[PDB]
Structure 1
C-alpha cells in the first residue's frame, strides 16, 4: 500500500504540499534565463524564485531538527 511515514516525515511534507509547485517553477525560470541571460525581466523574475526556494528549505530543515530534539529528551527519561 502507501509507504509508511512517521511524524517527522509529516512535518516535513507539510511544506512540500504547502508550496504548491515552487520546485518546478525554479527549474522553469532557470531554463528560461539560461536562454538569454541579458533580459532584465528574466533576471528580475529569477531572483524572487531563487530567494523563496532558499528560505523554504531552511525553514523545513530547522523545524525537523527541533522536533527531533524534543523527542530524544523524553525517550531518555524512560530509564
Structure 2
C-alpha cells in the first residue's frame, strides 16, 4: 500500500509548490520509493538467474 501514500503527497505540492516543509517531505518520500523499487527489481532477478543455473547445469 506504499503507492497510495506515494500518490497522496504529490497533489499538495502540486497545488502549493512553495512550502519549504512539503518539498522536504516529498523528496523524503520519493527517494524512499526509489530505494524500494529497485530493491524489488534486484531481488526477483537473483531468483530467476539461480533458477536458470540449475537447468543450465543439468542440460
Q: Does the pair score TM above 0.5?
A: yes
1:77 deviates by: 2.8
Q: How many residues align?
A: 59
The gaps in structure 1 that reach 5 residues or longer are: 1-20
By how many angstroms is 1:65 displaced? 0.7
- TM-score, normalising length: structure 1: 0.69
CA distance in 1, matches of 2:27, 2:40: 20
Deviation at 1:26, TM superposition (A): 1.2
Deviation at 1:49, TM superposition (A): 0.6
Give the C-alpha shift of residue 22 in structure 1. 1.9
What's the counterpart of residue 47 of structure 1?
Answer: 27
Give the distance between the partners of 2:58 and 2:21, measured in 1 at CA. Answer: 59
Flag structure 2 segments of 5+ consecutive residues without an equivalent: none
Which has the larger share of helix?
A: 2
- Tell me the secondary structure at the aligned position of residue 55 of structure 2: helix
**Larger RCO: 1 or 2 (CA < 8 Å, sep 6+):** 1
Q: Which runs of 4+ in 1 moved over 6 A?
A: none
